[PDB]
Amino acid sequence: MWRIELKHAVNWELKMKFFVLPELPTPDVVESGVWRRAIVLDGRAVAVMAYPESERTIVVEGNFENREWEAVRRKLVEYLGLQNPEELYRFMDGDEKLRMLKNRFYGFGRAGLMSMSVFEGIAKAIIQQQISFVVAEKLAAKIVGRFGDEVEWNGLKFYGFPTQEAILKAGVEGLRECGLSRRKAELIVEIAKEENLEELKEWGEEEAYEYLTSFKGIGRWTAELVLSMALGKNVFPADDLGVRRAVSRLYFNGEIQSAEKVREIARERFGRFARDILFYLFLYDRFFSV
Ligand code: NA
Ligand code: NA
């Protein structure tokens, strides 16, 4: 039992609403407002769960060590996006459409991440290519089911995204078996061979983008999605079709704009908060749209 004490209220129900298939282990499971997964910490999988005890207090329970609390706390703050949103909210107030987004999803706070590791973020971004998000999430669940860790703790099963070593063992055929196309299976396996992959999170955006796009089959949208969603960098993936739609609805009266036009909007209006606003745009595209 540990507490994460926030300076600002967070609406947990809106945080949880970000997940598309909360009940299915993707690897995350959310049941009755309780978030949980297994995470690999110093070479083994540990159970972690989180839920609010109040508007400014998130309770964490798990079978990791007291001495490991600091590191788990950091990981959860970042993954769930629990950081002080005061400055973001003030900034959003300064733009008519950002203010509307802020009011429609008020208490969502700052952006979290899509993954608990660089490897998970890259693999999921590859999976998601040219398919519906629901289909992508089901594929991730199959892969988690087959090759991810599973920890039983306190009457509950906690599921983890497969390690790089697990994916290497699974191999291209293991991934194809889960429903993944040959080339996507090949690419995830090639990524799994990369050592020190977790270090990418601390690379400069420029070097990280060049690295990501140096893989055949990883281009601009996939790289920028990883950068923003998985690496926490202020890189705005304007090629994303949900993003283009949301920005077009907000600023161009529902008339679909090019990625280059959407990029210009982001530079002019979103500034240092583009990565946070990105998550509000995703919600907007999902939840506000014979
Ligand atoms: Na889930
Ligand atoms: Na490439």
Protein model, in words:
- The chain is of the alpha+beta class.
- The protein has 3 domains: about 1-115, DNA-3-methyladenine glycosylase AlkA, N-terminal domain (TATA-Binding Protein), CATH 3.30.310.20; about 115-235, Hypothetical protein, domain 2 (Endonuclease III, domain 1), CATH 1.10.340; about 235-290, Orthogonal Bundle (Endonuclease Iii, domain 2), CATH 1.10.1670.10.
- About 50% of the residues lie in helices and about 15% in strands.
- The protein contains 13 helices and 7 strands.
- The protein has helices at about 10-15, 70-80, 85-95, 95-105, 120-130, 135-145, 165-175, 180-190, 205-215, 220-230, 240-250, 260-270, 275-285, and strands at about 1-5, 30, 35-40, 45-55, 55-60, 150-155, 155-160.
- The strands form 2 sheets. It has a 5-stranded antiparallel beta sheet with strand order 1-5-4-3-2, covered by helices on one side.
- Helix 5 crosses helix 10 (about 220-230), helix 7 (about 165-175) packs antiparallel against helix 8 (about 180-190) and helix 11 (about 240-250) crosses helix 13 (about 275-285).
- The longest helix has 15 residues, at about 135-145.
- The radius of gyration is 19 Å and the shape is globular.
- The structure holds sodium ion (2 copies).
- One sodium ion binds near residues 213, 215, 216 and 219.
